Structure formats: C-alpha cells, structure tokens
PDB file of C-alpha atoms in Angstrom:
ATOM      1  CA  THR K   1      -1.233   6.367  17.101  1.00 37.89           C
ATOM      2  CA  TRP K   2       2.520   6.767  17.479  1.00 37.37           C
ATOM      3  CA  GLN K   3       2.035  10.490  18.129  1.00 38.06           C
ATOM      4  CA  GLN K   4       0.293   9.994  21.481  1.00 38.87           C
ATOM      5  CA  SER K   5       2.903   7.522  22.714  1.00 33.13           C
ATOM      6  CA  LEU K   6       5.694   9.881  21.688  1.00 38.05           C
ATOM      7  CA  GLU K   7       3.932  12.753  23.455  1.00 38.65           C
ATOM      8  CA  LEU K   8       3.762  10.642  26.613  1.00 38.77           C
ATOM      9  CA  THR K   9       7.457   9.834  26.287  1.00 39.35           C
ATOM     10  CA  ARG K  10       8.263  13.509  25.734  1.00 40.47           C
ATOM     11  CA  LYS K  11       6.241  14.502  28.793  1.00 38.29           C
ATOM     12  CA  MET K  12       8.102  11.961  30.919  1.00 41.75           C
ATOM     13  CA  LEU K  13      11.423  13.189  29.529  1.00 41.06           C
ATOM     14  CA  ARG K  14      10.449  16.774  30.344  1.00 41.25           C
ATOM     15  CA  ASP K  15       9.535  15.759  33.884  1.00 41.28           C
ATOM     16  CA  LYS K  16      12.859  13.972  34.304  1.00 40.80           C
ATOM     17  CA  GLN K  17      14.850  16.874  32.911  1.00 40.32           C
ATOM     18  CA  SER K  18      13.059  19.319  35.185  1.00 41.83           C
ATOM     19  CA  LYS K  19      13.676  16.920  38.075  1.00 44.36           C
ATOM     20  CA  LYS K  20      17.404  16.975  37.259  1.00 46.83           C
ATOM     21  CA  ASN K  21      17.738  20.720  36.572  1.00 47.98           C
ATOM     22  CA  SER K  22      16.469  21.663  40.056  1.00 45.81           C
ATOM     23  CA  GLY K  23      13.746  23.751  38.412  1.00 45.19           C
ATOM     24  CA  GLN K  24      15.795  25.690  35.875  1.00 45.78           C
ATOM     25  CA  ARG K  25      13.839  26.676  32.778  1.00 48.30           C
ATOM     26  CA  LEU K  26      13.948  24.197  29.902  1.00 47.21           C
ATOM     27  CA  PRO K  27      13.266  24.843  26.218  1.00 47.31           C
ATOM     28  CA  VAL K  28       9.840  23.790  24.985  1.00 50.37           C
ATOM     29  CA  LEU K  29       8.603  23.789  21.406  1.00 49.83           C
ATOM     30  CA  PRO K  30       5.407  25.799  20.831  1.00 50.88           C
ATOM     31  CA  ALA K  31       2.555  23.349  20.888  1.00 48.96           C
ATOM     32  CA  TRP K  32       1.389  23.864  17.312  1.00 48.10           C
ATOM     33  CA  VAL K  33       4.556  22.127  16.099  1.00 49.68           C
ATOM     34  CA  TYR K  34       3.443  18.891  17.721  1.00 50.19           C
ATOM     35  CA  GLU K  35      -0.256  19.708  17.312  1.00 50.43           C
ATOM     36  CA  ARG K  36      -0.251  20.246  13.523  1.00 52.66           C
ATOM     37  CA  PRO K  37      -0.304  17.204  11.207  1.00 52.84           C
ATOM     38  CA  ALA K  38       0.131  19.450   8.171  1.00 53.02           C
ATOM     39  CA  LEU K  39       3.771  20.084   9.134  1.00 51.28           C
ATOM     40  CA  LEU K  40       4.706  16.423   9.464  1.00 48.35           C
ATOM     41  CA  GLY K  41       7.295  15.119   7.029  1.00 46.71           C
ATOM     42  CA  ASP K  42       5.405  11.869   6.454  1.00 46.22           C
ATOM     43  CA  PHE K  43       2.154  11.507   4.483  1.00 49.55           C
ATOM     44  CA  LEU K  44      -0.971  13.526   5.237  1.00 50.31           C
ATOM     45  CA  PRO K  45      -3.994  11.285   5.926  1.00 52.14           C
ATOM     46  CA  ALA K  46      -8.346   9.547 -11.344  1.00 51.47           C
ATOM     47  CA  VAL K  47      -9.240   7.060 -14.077  1.00 49.08           C
ATOM     48  CA  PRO K  48      -9.159   3.420 -12.934  1.00 49.77           C
ATOM     49  CA  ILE K  49      -5.886   1.885 -13.974  1.00 50.04           C
ATOM     50  CA  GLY K  50      -7.232  -1.387 -15.314  1.00 48.56           C
ATOM     51  CA  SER K  51      -8.891   0.432 -18.208  1.00 46.48           C
ATOM     52  CA  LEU K  52      -5.552   1.889 -19.363  1.00 50.25           C
ATOM     53  CA  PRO K  53      -3.348   0.277 -21.996  1.00 51.34           C
ATOM     54  CA  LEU K  54      -0.362  -1.476 -20.501  1.00 51.87           C
ATOM     55  CA  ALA K  55       1.980   1.354 -21.427  1.00 53.99           C
ATOM     56  CA  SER K  56      -0.603   3.840 -20.183  1.00 55.09           C
ATOM     57  CA  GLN K  57      -0.900   1.750 -17.044  1.00 57.35           C
ATOM     58  CA  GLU K  58       2.857   2.074 -16.593  1.00 56.57           C
ATOM     59  CA  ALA K  59       2.662   5.826 -17.143  1.00 56.88           C
ATOM     60  CA  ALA K  60      -0.100   6.343 -14.586  1.00 54.33           C
ATOM     61  CA  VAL K  61       1.713   4.042 -12.183  1.00 54.93           C
ATOM     62  CA  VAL K  62       4.927   5.996 -12.594  1.00 49.97           C
ATOM     63  CA  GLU K  63       3.051   9.215 -11.881  1.00 50.09           C
ATOM     64  CA  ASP K  64       1.561   7.762  -8.709  1.00 47.28           C
ATOM     65  CA  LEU K  65       4.978   6.378  -7.772  1.00 46.32           C
ATOM     66  CA  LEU K  66       6.676   9.724  -8.246  1.00 50.51           C
ATOM     67  CA  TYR K  67       4.084  11.239  -5.941  1.00 51.22           C
ATOM     68  CA  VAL K  68       4.493   8.396  -3.445  1.00 52.92           C
ATOM     69  CA  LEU K  69       8.295   8.582  -3.283  1.00 52.16           C
ATOM     70  CA  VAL K  70       8.028  12.001  -1.630  1.00 49.98           C
ATOM     71  CA  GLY K  71       5.197  11.118   0.734  1.00 49.67           C
ATOM     72  CA  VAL K  72       2.311  12.191  -1.502  1.00 52.45           C
ATOM     73  CA  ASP K  73      -0.588  10.006  -2.586  1.00 53.74           C
ATOM     74  CA  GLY K  74      -1.086   9.137  -6.240  1.00 57.81           C
ATOM     75  CA  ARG K  75      -4.360   8.740  -8.085  1.00 58.64           C
ATOM     76  CA  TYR K  76      -4.345   4.940  -8.408  1.00 60.02           C
ATOM     77  CA  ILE K  77      -1.754   4.379  -5.663  1.00 61.92           C
ATOM     78  CA  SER K  78      -2.943   5.336  -2.186  1.00 62.01           C
ATOM     79  CA  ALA K  79      -1.432   5.240   1.292  1.00 62.13           C
ATOM     80  CA  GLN K  80      -2.892   3.420   4.289  1.00 63.64           C
ATOM     81  CA  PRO K  81      -2.716   5.180   7.675  1.00 58.99           C
ATOM     82  CA  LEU K  82      -0.473   3.573  10.261  1.00 55.51           C
ATOM     83  CA  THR K  83      -1.098   2.223  13.751  1.00 55.47           C
ATOM     84  CA  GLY K  84       1.758   2.460  16.210  1.00 57.40           C
ATOM     85  CA  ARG K  85       5.191   3.340  14.928  1.00 57.61           C
ATOM     86  CA  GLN K  86       5.472   1.546  11.590  1.00 59.04           C
ATOM     87  CA  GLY K  87       6.606   2.151   8.059  1.00 58.65           C
ATOM     88  CA  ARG K  88       3.926   3.504   5.776  1.00 63.57           C
ATOM     89  CA  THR K  89       1.460   0.952   4.460  1.00 60.11           C
ATOM     90  CA  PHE K  90       0.044   1.589   0.999  1.00 63.22           C
ATOM     91  CA  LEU K  91      -3.155   0.607  -0.778  1.00 63.12           C
ATOM     92  CA  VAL K  92      -2.684  -0.196  -4.468  1.00 63.86           C
ATOM     93  CA  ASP K  93      -5.562  -0.024  -6.899  1.00 62.01           C
ATOM     94  CA  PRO K  94      -6.650  -3.630  -7.555  1.00 61.70           C
ATOM     95  CA  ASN K  95      -7.425  -3.010 -11.224  1.00 61.27           C
ATOM     96  CA  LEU K  96      -3.693  -2.613 -11.823  1.00 61.28           C
ATOM     97  CA  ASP K  97      -1.886  -5.471 -13.528  1.00 55.50           C
ATOM     98  CA  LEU K  98      -0.472  -8.011 -11.103  1.00 54.28           C
ATOM     99  CA  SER K  99       3.018  -7.647 -12.555  1.00 51.23           C
ATOM    100  CA  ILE K 100       2.917  -3.867 -12.202  1.00 50.88           C
ATOM    101  CA  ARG K 101       1.659  -4.258  -8.650  1.00 51.19           C
ATOM    102  CA  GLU K 102       4.557  -6.571  -7.833  1.00 50.41           C
ATOM    103  CA  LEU K 103       7.045  -4.134  -9.317  1.00 47.15           C
TER     104      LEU K 103
ATOM    105  CA  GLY J   1      -9.818 -16.726 -32.714  1.00 45.21           C
ATOM    106  CA  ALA J   2      -7.106 -18.222 -30.526  1.00 43.61           C
ATOM    107  CA  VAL J   3      -4.871 -15.851 -28.573  1.00 40.79           C
ATOM    108  CA  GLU J   4      -1.318 -15.887 -29.883  1.00 39.90           C
ATOM    109  CA  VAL J   5       0.934 -13.621 -27.855  1.00 42.04           C
ATOM    110  CA  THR J   6       2.766 -11.077 -29.930  1.00 41.10           C
ATOM    111  CA  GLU J   7       6.539 -11.021 -30.016  1.00 40.39           C
ATOM    112  CA  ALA J   8       6.535  -7.751 -28.074  1.00 37.49           C
ATOM    113  CA  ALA J   9       4.112  -9.063 -25.462  1.00 38.43           C
ATOM    114  CA  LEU J  10       6.095 -12.263 -25.062  1.00 33.22           C
ATOM    115  CA  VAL J  11       9.226 -10.151 -24.707  1.00 33.86           C
ATOM    116  CA  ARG J  12       7.573  -8.071 -21.996  1.00 37.00           C
ATOM    117  CA  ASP J  13       6.445 -11.183 -20.151  1.00 37.34           C
ATOM    118  CA  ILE J  14       9.877 -12.793 -20.405  1.00 37.02           C
ATOM    119  CA  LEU J  15      11.464  -9.568 -19.205  1.00 38.25           C
ATOM    120  CA  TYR J  16       9.188  -9.682 -16.181  1.00 37.98           C
ATOM    121  CA  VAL J  17      10.230 -13.301 -15.737  1.00 36.95           C
ATOM    122  CA  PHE J  18      13.820 -12.129 -15.802  1.00 37.82           C
ATOM    123  CA  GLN J  19      12.928  -9.473 -13.268  1.00 36.41           C
ATOM    124  CA  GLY J  20      11.628 -12.259 -11.078  1.00 37.48           C
ATOM    125  CA  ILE J  21       7.923 -11.468 -11.509  1.00 40.38           C
ATOM    126  CA  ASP J  22       5.769 -13.625 -13.748  1.00 40.73           C
ATOM    127  CA  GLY J  23       4.236 -12.419 -16.997  1.00 40.39           C
ATOM    128  CA  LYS J  24       0.651 -12.489 -18.218  1.00 42.24           C
ATOM    129  CA  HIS J  25       1.017 -15.574 -20.435  1.00 44.51           C
ATOM    130  CA  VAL J  26       4.331 -17.033 -19.190  1.00 43.12           C
ATOM    131  CA  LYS J  27       4.225 -17.851 -15.485  1.00 45.25           C
ATOM    132  CA  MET J  28       6.613 -19.410 -13.001  1.00 44.30           C
ATOM    133  CA  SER J  29       5.870 -23.102 -12.710  1.00 42.85           C
ATOM    134  CA  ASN J  30       6.824 -23.709  -9.084  1.00 41.96           C
ATOM    135  CA  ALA J  31       6.714 -27.466  -9.684  1.00 44.36           C
ATOM    136  CA  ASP J  32       9.898 -27.158 -11.722  1.00 42.65           C
ATOM    137  CA  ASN J  33      11.163 -23.822 -10.335  1.00 41.46           C
ATOM    138  CA  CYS J  34      11.153 -22.260 -13.790  1.00 45.62           C
ATOM    139  CA  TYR J  35       8.775 -20.219 -15.902  1.00 47.63           C
ATOM    140  CA  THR J  36       6.537 -22.215 -18.235  1.00 47.91           C
ATOM    141  CA  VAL J  37       4.450 -20.666 -20.985  1.00 49.36           C
ATOM    142  CA  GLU J  38       0.764 -21.364 -20.509  1.00 48.96           C
ATOM    143  CA  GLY J  39      -1.025 -23.440 -23.116  1.00 47.60           C
ATOM    144  CA  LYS J  40      -4.133 -21.269 -23.046  1.00 50.58           C
ATOM    145  CA  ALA J  41      -2.177 -18.959 -25.328  1.00 51.22           C
ATOM    146  CA  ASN J  42      -1.147 -20.576 -28.608  1.00 51.79           C
ATOM    147  CA  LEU J  43       2.454 -19.931 -29.632  1.00 50.56           C
ATOM    148  CA  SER J  44       4.600 -21.789 -32.112  1.00 51.60           C
ATOM    149  CA  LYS J  45       6.957 -24.495 -30.944  1.00 56.09           C
ATOM    150  CA  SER J  46       9.987 -22.311 -31.573  1.00 56.30           C
ATOM    151  CA  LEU J  47       8.486 -19.460 -29.581  1.00 57.04           C
ATOM    152  CA  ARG J  48       7.800 -21.801 -26.663  1.00 56.50           C
ATOM    153  CA  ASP J  49      11.340 -23.183 -26.857  1.00 55.26           C
ATOM    154  CA  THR J  50      12.808 -19.697 -26.799  1.00 59.36           C
ATOM    155  CA  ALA J  51      10.551 -18.868 -23.876  1.00 59.56           C
ATOM    156  CA  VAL J  52      11.853 -21.849 -21.916  1.00 60.53           C
ATOM    157  CA  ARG J  53      15.442 -21.030 -22.829  1.00 59.41           C
ATOM    158  CA  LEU J  54      14.881 -17.539 -21.469  1.00 57.69           C
ATOM    159  CA  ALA J  55      12.995 -18.532 -18.317  1.00 60.08           C
ATOM    160  CA  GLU J  56      16.060 -20.520 -17.337  1.00 57.38           C
ATOM    161  CA  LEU J  57      17.444 -17.071 -16.578  1.00 55.84           C
ATOM    162  CA  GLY J  58      14.418 -16.206 -14.463  1.00 56.69           C
ATOM    163  CA  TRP J  59      14.976 -19.393 -12.496  1.00 59.01           C
ATOM    164  CA  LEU J  60      18.574 -18.404 -11.793  1.00 55.18           C
ATOM    165  CA  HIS J  61      17.456 -14.859 -10.952  1.00 54.92           C
ATOM    166  CA  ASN J  62      14.937 -16.095  -8.425  1.00 57.80           C
ATOM    167  CA  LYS J  63      17.453 -18.462  -6.868  1.00 59.07           C
ATOM    168  CA  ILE J  64      19.933 -15.630  -6.342  1.00 61.45           C
ATOM    169  CA  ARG J  65      17.112 -13.473  -4.993  1.00 61.54           C
ATOM    170  CA  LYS J  66      16.007 -16.067  -2.463  1.00 57.08           C
ATOM    171  CA  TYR J  67      19.575 -16.626  -1.306  1.00 57.20           C
ATOM    172  CA  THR J  68      20.145 -12.922  -0.777  1.00 54.22           C
ATOM    173  CA  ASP J  69      16.836 -12.450   1.023  1.00 52.51           C
ATOM    174  CA  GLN J  70      17.495 -15.396   3.315  1.00 48.93           C
ATOM    175  CA  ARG J  71      21.040 -14.519   4.318  1.00 44.30           C
ATOM    176  CA  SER J  72      20.130 -10.830   4.677  1.00 39.44           C
ATOM    177  CA  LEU J  73      17.932 -11.360   7.754  1.00 37.53           C
ATOM    178  CA  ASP J  74      20.427 -13.259   9.954  1.00 35.31           C
ATOM    179  CA  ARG J  75      22.458 -10.865  12.085  1.00 31.73           C
ATOM    180  CA  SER J  76      24.209 -14.060  13.184  1.00 30.95           C
ATOM    181  CA  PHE J  77      25.632 -14.541   9.679  1.00 32.20           C
ATOM    182  CA  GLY J  78      28.309 -11.934  10.379  1.00 31.16           C
ATOM    183  CA  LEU J  79      29.876  -9.068   8.492  1.00 30.71           C
ATOM    184  CA  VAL J  80      31.560 -11.323   5.932  1.00 30.26           C
ATOM    185  CA  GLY J  81      28.221 -12.852   4.979  1.00 29.14           C
ATOM    186  CA  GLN J  82      26.645  -9.421   4.717  1.00 31.63           C
ATOM    187  CA  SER J  83      29.488  -8.265   2.473  1.00 27.88           C
ATOM    188  CA  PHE J  84      29.013 -11.304   0.260  1.00 33.30           C
ATOM    189  CA  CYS J  85      25.321 -10.477   0.036  1.00 36.48           C
ATOM    190  CA  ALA J  86      26.156  -6.857  -0.786  1.00 37.07           C
ATOM    191  CA  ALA J  87      28.478  -7.881  -3.605  1.00 35.07           C
ATOM    192  CA  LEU J  88      25.767 -10.182  -4.907  1.00 35.29           C
ATOM    193  CA  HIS J  89      23.221  -7.377  -4.744  1.00 37.07           C
ATOM    194  CA  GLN J  90      25.668  -5.266  -6.754  1.00 37.25           C
ATOM    195  CA  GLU J  91      25.990  -7.881  -9.474  1.00 36.92           C
ATOM    196  CA  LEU J  92      22.206  -8.220  -9.431  1.00 37.17           C
ATOM    197  CA  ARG J  93      21.850  -4.496  -9.987  1.00 38.93           C
ATOM    198  CA  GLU J  94      24.237  -4.736 -12.922  1.00 40.82           C
ATOM    199  CA  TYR J  95      21.939  -7.418 -14.294  1.00 39.95           C
ATOM    200  CA  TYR J  96      18.968  -5.148 -13.706  1.00 38.89           C
ATOM    201  CA  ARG J  97      20.724  -2.283 -15.495  1.00 37.73           C
ATOM    202  CA  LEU J  98      21.100  -4.520 -18.502  1.00 40.15           C
ATOM    203  CA  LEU J  99      17.469  -5.504 -18.156  1.00 40.36           C
TER     204      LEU J  99
END
C-alpha cells in the first residue's frame, strides 16, 4: 500500500530534518490525520444493469458515473483498491452493454 | 421472426460507430478498417448502404484517434507535435459536440 511507503519516506524526511536542525523542534501532524482513511480525498475502500432498458442502462450508468467522478462508488460501477501508488482502478458491472462500458 | 434493427437503434449504433465504439448490430470490420453491418440482423439494402456511408465517418474518426494516441506518448516528438495533437483534439471535440 502506498500509505506505508509514504510513511517510511516521511519518517526518513523527519529524521533528516531533525539531523539538519540540530535538534530544534519540528512541526508534526497529529497522527490521526495519517491514521484515518475516512479523511482521505480518494475513494474509501442496486439492480443489475443488464436487466435495464438501454436508456435506463444509460441513466443508471450516469448515476454511477456522477458518483465516481467525485471519488464515490456507484451501484453498478465499483472501484478496485490500488496496490502501490497508482491511479484508481475500477470494476464495471459485466451485465452492462459493451458499448456503454467502452464509453 | 427475423430481427430488423429499428431506425432509432441503427442510428444509435451508427452514432457509437461515429464515437469510435462499435454498435450492437453494426460492428467495426477490422479487415477493411470500417464498420460493417452484421448480416444476422436483416435490414433493407438502402439501410445497409446508408450504414456503410456513415461508417466511413467512423473509419476516419478511428484513424484520427489512433494518430493522436500514438503521437501523444512520444516526449521525443517535441512541443510542435504536441501542439498539433492538441489542435487535432480540439477539432475532435468539436466533432463530438456535434455528435
């Protein structure tokens, strides 16, 4: 998970700053900021779409999309958790129409 | 009863073809690099001819798309190439706004 690697980097940066400040106090963010997923700005880790009429499929898709554009999972569009630092990967309901899925 | 694709459904499929993504009854034949209407669905000769005449546009669309995608990844192509690709993207978006 990217979080652990970034925490290691931050620890090393802290150690280097303290090593350069000759032991002057440095600012440190209270731990819960780094220790709380529910304050991340990324994502937080329904009727099946293939039974909907094409226009209804589009409507449900647009709802899921509007959720997903702000980092929130839809009903028939779902996010896939990441490994390492990557852009979000998404799972799309496979009963959607191929054309809709491409779009 | 045979499946004949309605005018609206054929329009939707051809509009997907214009958008560069195949329809449900008209699909990109990649052995001609243009969208051909399947024969599983039964449409009149005139409808098929119109479909071909329209999928010409999808062929051109996909060509422009491939060119932009390809030149977009080469940092070596320089700022002038990137600006050409940006202008082409802009024209493409105009096309999409009409679509």
